[PDB]
Design an enzyme around this catalytic site. Structure first.
Site, PDB file in Angstrom:
ATOM      1  N   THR A  13       0.821  -1.199   0.000  1.00  0.00           N
ATOM      2  CA  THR A  13       0.000   0.000   0.000  1.00  0.00           C
ATOM      3  C   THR A  13       0.859   1.253   0.000  1.00  0.00           C
ATOM      4  O   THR A  13       2.000   1.242   0.470  1.00  0.00           O
ATOM      5  CB  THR A  13      -0.947   0.033   1.214  1.00  0.00           C
ATOM      6  OG1 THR A  13      -1.769   1.203   1.143  1.00  0.00           O
ATOM      7  CG2 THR A  13      -0.156   0.045   2.513  1.00  0.00           C
ATOM      8  N   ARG A  14       0.304   2.335  -0.531  1.00  0.00           N
ATOM      9  CA  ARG A  14       1.025   3.598  -0.605  1.00  0.00           C
ATOM     10  C   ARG A  14       0.130   4.718  -0.102  1.00  0.00           C
ATOM     11  O   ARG A  14       0.482   5.891  -0.186  1.00  0.00           O
ATOM     12  CB  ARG A  14       1.427   3.887  -2.055  1.00  0.00           C
ATOM     13  CG  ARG A  14       0.301   4.483  -2.882  1.00  0.00           C
ATOM     14  CD  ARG A  14       0.600   4.471  -4.370  1.00  0.00           C
ATOM     15  NE  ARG A  14      -0.336   5.325  -5.099  1.00  0.00           N
ATOM     16  CZ  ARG A  14      -0.709   5.132  -6.361  1.00  0.00           C
ATOM     17  NH1 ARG A  14      -0.235   4.103  -7.057  1.00  0.00           N
ATOM     18  NH2 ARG A  14      -1.554   5.982  -6.932  1.00  0.00           N
ATOM     19  N   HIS A  49      -8.674   2.631   3.388  1.00  0.00           N
ATOM     20  CA  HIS A  49     -10.078   2.852   3.075  1.00  0.00           C
ATOM     21  C   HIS A  49     -10.754   1.472   3.085  1.00  0.00           C
ATOM     22  O   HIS A  49     -10.074   0.444   3.047  1.00  0.00           O
ATOM     23  CB  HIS A  49     -10.251   3.600   1.738  1.00  0.00           C
ATOM     24  CG  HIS A  49      -9.843   2.828   0.522  1.00  0.00           C
ATOM     25  ND1 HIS A  49      -9.597   3.440  -0.689  1.00  0.00           N
ATOM     26  CD2 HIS A  49      -9.678   1.502   0.311  1.00  0.00           C
ATOM     27  CE1 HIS A  49      -9.298   2.524  -1.593  1.00  0.00           C
ATOM     28  NE2 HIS A  49      -9.340   1.339  -1.012  1.00  0.00           N
ATOM     29  N   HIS A  97      -9.406  -1.267   1.001  1.00  0.00           N
ATOM     30  CA  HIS A  97      -8.084  -1.725   1.419  1.00  0.00           C
ATOM     31  C   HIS A  97      -8.259  -2.752   2.535  1.00  0.00           C
ATOM     32  O   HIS A  97      -7.686  -3.845   2.497  1.00  0.00           O
ATOM     33  CB  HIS A  97      -7.246  -0.552   1.953  1.00  0.00           C
ATOM     34  CG  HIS A  97      -6.793   0.410   0.899  1.00  0.00           C
ATOM     35  ND1 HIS A  97      -6.777   1.774   1.098  1.00  0.00           N
ATOM     36  CD2 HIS A  97      -6.329   0.209  -0.358  1.00  0.00           C
ATOM     37  CE1 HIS A  97      -6.326   2.371   0.008  1.00  0.00           C
ATOM     38  NE2 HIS A  97      -6.047   1.443  -0.890  1.00  0.00           N
ATOM     39  N   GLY A 111      -4.694  -6.095  -6.114  1.00  0.00           N
ATOM     40  CA  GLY A 111      -6.063  -5.713  -6.405  1.00  0.00           C
ATOM     41  C   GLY A 111      -6.236  -5.071  -7.768  1.00  0.00           C
ATOM     42  O   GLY A 111      -5.528  -5.409  -8.713  1.00  0.00           O
ATOM     43  N   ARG A 112      -7.193  -4.152  -7.871  1.00  0.00           N
ATOM     44  CA  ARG A 112      -7.451  -3.453  -9.127  1.00  0.00           C
ATOM     45  C   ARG A 112      -6.421  -2.342  -9.323  1.00  0.00           C
ATOM     46  O   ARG A 112      -6.047  -1.658  -8.370  1.00  0.00           O
ATOM     47  CB  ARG A 112      -8.867  -2.851  -9.125  1.00  0.00           C
ATOM     48  CG  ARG A 112      -9.234  -2.084 -10.400  1.00  0.00           C
ATOM     49  CD  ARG A 112     -10.711  -1.689 -10.424  1.00  0.00           C
ATOM     50  NE  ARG A 112     -11.103  -0.992 -11.654  1.00  0.00           N
ATOM     51  CZ  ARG A 112     -10.804   0.275 -11.933  1.00  0.00           C
ATOM     52  NH1 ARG A 112     -10.105   1.007 -11.072  1.00  0.00           N
ATOM     53  NH2 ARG A 112     -11.204   0.816 -13.079  1.00  0.00           N
TER      54      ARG A 112
HETATM   55  N1  LIG Z   1     -10.911  -0.071  -4.788  1.00  0.00           N
HETATM   56  C1  LIG Z   1     -10.042  -1.090  -4.894  1.00  0.00           C
HETATM   57  N2  LIG Z   1     -10.439  -2.327  -5.347  1.00  0.00           N
HETATM   58  C2  LIG Z   1      -9.536  -3.372  -5.453  1.00  0.00           C
HETATM   59  N3  LIG Z   1      -8.220  -3.413  -5.170  1.00  0.00           N
HETATM   60  C3  LIG Z   1      -7.856  -2.150  -4.715  1.00  0.00           C
HETATM   61  C4  LIG Z   1      -8.657  -0.987  -4.555  1.00  0.00           C
HETATM   62  N4  LIG Z   1      -7.920   0.060  -4.085  1.00  0.00           N
HETATM   63  C5  LIG Z   1      -6.738  -0.472  -3.975  1.00  0.00           C
HETATM   64  N5  LIG Z   1      -6.614  -1.800  -4.334  1.00  0.00           N
HETATM   65  C6  LIG Z   1      -5.465  -2.693  -4.335  1.00  0.00           C
HETATM   66  O1  LIG Z   1      -4.946  -2.686  -2.925  1.00  0.00           O
HETATM   67  C7  LIG Z   1      -3.544  -2.356  -2.821  1.00  0.00           C
HETATM   68  C8  LIG Z   1      -3.661  -0.915  -2.417  1.00  0.00           C
HETATM   69  O2  LIG Z   1      -3.010  -0.152  -3.295  1.00  0.00           O
HETATM   70  P1  LIG Z   1      -2.911   1.440  -3.233  1.00  0.00           P
HETATM   71  O3  LIG Z   1      -2.108   1.857  -2.086  1.00  0.00           O
HETATM   72  O4  LIG Z   1      -4.230   2.120  -3.390  1.00  0.00           O
HETATM   73  O5  LIG Z   1      -1.997   1.676  -4.541  1.00  0.00           O
HETATM   74  S1  LIG Z   1      -0.663   0.848  -4.928  1.00  0.00           S
HETATM   75  O6  LIG Z   1       0.187   1.764  -5.703  1.00  0.00           O
HETATM   76  O7  LIG Z   1      -0.030   0.477  -3.644  1.00  0.00           O
HETATM   77  O8  LIG Z   1      -1.058  -0.373  -5.599  1.00  0.00           O
HETATM   78  C9  LIG Z   1      -3.100  -2.809  -4.255  1.00  0.00           C
HETATM   79  O9  LIG Z   1      -3.033  -4.288  -4.309  1.00  0.00           O
HETATM   80  C10 LIG Z   1      -4.266  -2.324  -5.146  1.00  0.00           C
HETATM   81  O10 LIG Z   1      -4.256  -2.928  -6.429  1.00  0.00           O
END
Ligand SMILES: Nc1ncnc2c1ncn2[C@@H]1O[C@H](COP(=O)(O)OS(=O)(=O)O)[C@@H](O)[C@H]1O
Ligand SMILES: Nc1ncnc2c1ncn2[C@@H]1O[C@H](COP(=O)(O)OS(=O)(=O)O)[C@@H](O)[C@H]1O
Ligand SMILES: [Cl-]
Ligand SMILES: [Cl-]
Ligand SMILES: [Cl-]
Ligand SMILES: [Cl-]
Ligand SMILES: [Cl-]
Ligand code: NA
Ligand code: NA
Ligand code: NA
Ligand code: NA
Ligand SMILES: [Zn+2]
Ligand SMILES: [Zn+2]
Lengths: 346, 343
Positions: free
Chosen positions: B160-161, B165, B168, B253-254
């Site tokens: 995560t970055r 929410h 998450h 995820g997405r």
């Molecule tokens: N609304 C969502 N639905 C499905 N997977 C999500 C969603 N938001 C985030 N993810 C997934 O959860 C992790 C959270 O990522 P983020 O912090 O938003 O962005 S990332 O750059 O680290 O991938 C990643 O595996 C991402 O693909």
């Protein structure tokens, strides 16, 4: 004419499961040696894992022996042919202790066993008059063919003997998240009195699938065989049989296949630890309930100990009690839309 | 005294990740053959799978060469020693198009890449002045030990970055059902402006973990490396790295590690199909949203198509850009986390 012997429904259902490969590697009603090693060591004499004895019992010793071919009667007509390989008697009480963990006739599974008689016949069987099946009652080959056709590689199977509540649905959803498809496989054979009739199980699940789940990825088929209510050991049986239907995964929640509270809640999780890999992955999930803090349906593996106080247990026993009382099961137990279906079979 | 070269924050972090085995099999800042084989055929020359090029770049060609020992300087001291095994220049544009799938400076990833310089050095590295790490900034070996310390044999890692929410948490929940424990491994390196500050996410998470999750089975450590926003390729990167930290499973995820709408929401999913078994299981999960009919947070794999027009998408962007004085609905963000998201 051939020697004939009347047989009940449990027998007609299981001789068919044998002939269709549902019970593979078991291929015929067990010999005394097979029955005993299965019951006490959880293995067939040849070494394969198996935990539930498949028997053809009688109250009076049959007038047949090794080598004879016997006609099996049911519903008045000759339904199948048995190739007697052995004739013996069993000490049901000792058998029940090994299979169920108790010999008390208060255990539904134990009572059914005792009721069939101590005289047993072993041997392969051939189906003559197949019993009429509905579209739901598919054979292991039909199910595996169904999976191939839709291109499902990873398939999680879900066992059940009841109508669905929100906890059951959580397991199904967990399965949907990990596989190409989920197989909801209700038991269609004899059940103890307070389980929901198959007709309401069928209507309830079809409604749950049709309105709340991706119809697209939930195969709904029925497994016609009695419930043994043998908890841990029946769980292994359930997984192995699902493996024959093409499942690559099998869900095992809280008190899988238990009766009341006789077996420890997670003994069915642990039993797999004392067995070799089975050729099907076991997906274990703890108690599932409703949590106001978490925000809905959750489990012990996702809900903090500190939430306990606010948790609401989910079980069909409670649900039926509420219904038999005229009250309406709350939204955190069962979906309101399924209620009319449930009140109908209580 | 030996030759001295200055290095940026990013450089300081990865040199240590290289020494701590966090980037295994990547030994040190790769060569030219290494940088190209990785970026074009997702493999090291050796054969191991790797997608993100680890490079030490300069806007001005260093005067050093092969066989030389160079002293690297971060603040005002010798942080580590570099054993240059090769020196060269790269076509950042042709390197970017391969790595990020584009070379448009509009991409937060290609940008940072360019501003680092087309000149680079290769070679093993030795740390002499380990940078101060808080309790969260644990090394690969320190995390592997933390697992055996609790006997966790099956571990699901979550990348995560941003701040937590509902969507998450959903993925973390899924992980908690599949393993003895889940590792929430936030990125501690440099992220683009809109992504919530490490400080706030760090305080928002342990509040979540403490008041809404099995405090006992949720490991909260941070990965000290920058965000590349390389989408699919960075996903494989995240996977392999978390593998080194001892995770057996990794969640994707997405639109994993994506920016704007640059990559296809499921590209980070398919890329694993084109790669061999990595040694860590990838747990794919689709879009996660809120659904009144399903009765809460569900996913593309658990909510039927017929409920679509009722779903409530979940994105940290909308949220972030909505405190416009508004208030994020409960079905997207836990109310108990606003006082932290606002500050
Ligand atoms: N609304 C969502 N639905 C499905 N997977 C999500 C969603 N938001 C985030 N993810 C997934 O959860 C992790 C959270 O990522 P983020 O912090 O938003 O962005 S990332 O750059 O680290 O991938 C990643 O595996 C991402 O693909
Ligand atoms: N409240 C619950 N929490 C978790 N798992 C449950 C719960 N109720 C039932 N299960 C599990 O879900 C499946 C549903 O089983 P049931 O139809 O209730 O009875 S059983 O005889 O098939 O086990 C089994 O794997 C069971 O262990
Ligand atoms: Cl419809
Ligand atoms: Cl039960
Ligand atoms: Cl019961
Ligand atoms: Cl046992
Ligand atoms: Cl839900
Ligand atoms: Na008796
Ligand atoms: Na009993
Ligand atoms: Na350029
Ligand atoms: Na569809
Ligand atoms: Zn809770
Ligand atoms: Zn829905």
């Amino acid at each position: 004419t051939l020697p004939a012997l009347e047989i009940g429904e449990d027998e007609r259902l299981d001789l068919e499961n044998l002939a269709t490969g549902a019970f593979f590697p078991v291929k015929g009603f067990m010999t005394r040696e097979e029955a005993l090693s299965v019951a006490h060591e959880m293995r067939l004499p040849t070494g394969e894992v198996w935990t539930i004895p498949i028997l053809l019992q009688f109250r009076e010793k049959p007038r047949v022996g090794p080598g004879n071919t016997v006609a099996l009667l049911h519903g008045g007509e000759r339904v199948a042919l048995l190739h007697v390989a052995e004739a013996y008697e069993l000490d049901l009480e000792a058998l029940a202790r090994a299979v169920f963990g108790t010999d008390s006739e208060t255990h539904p599974g134990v009572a059914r066993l005792y009721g069939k008689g101590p005289y047993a016949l072993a041997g392969r069987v051939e189906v003559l008059k197949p019993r009429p099946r509905t579209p739901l009652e598919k054979t292991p080959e039909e199910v595996r063919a169904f999976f191939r056709q839709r291109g499902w590689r990873k398939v999680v199977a879900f066992q059940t003997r009841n109508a669905p509540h929100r906890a059951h649905e959580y397991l199904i959803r967990l399965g949907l998240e990990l596989a190409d498809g989920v197989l909801v496989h209700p038991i269609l054979g004899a059940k103890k009195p307070d389980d929901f009739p198959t007709e309401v199980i069928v209507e309830a699940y079809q409604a749950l699938i049709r309105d709340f789940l991706p119809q697209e990825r939930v195969a709904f088929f029925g497994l016609a065989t009695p419930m043994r209510y043998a908890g841990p050991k029946e769980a292994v049986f359930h997984a192995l049989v699902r493996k024959n239907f093409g499942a690559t995964h099998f869900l095992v929640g809280r008190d899988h296949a238990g009766v009341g509270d006789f077996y420890d809640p997670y003994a069915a999780h642990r039993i797999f630890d004392r067995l070799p890999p089975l050729g099907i992955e076991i997906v274990k999930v703890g108690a599932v309930f409703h949590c106001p803090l978490c925000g809905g349906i959750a489990s012990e593996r996702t809900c903090p100990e500190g939430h306990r106080e606010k948790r609401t247990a989910i079980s069909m026993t409670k649900v039926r009690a509420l219904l038999r009382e005229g009250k309406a099961p709350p939204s955190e137990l069962v979906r309101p839309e399924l209620l009319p279906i449930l009140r109908r079979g209580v």
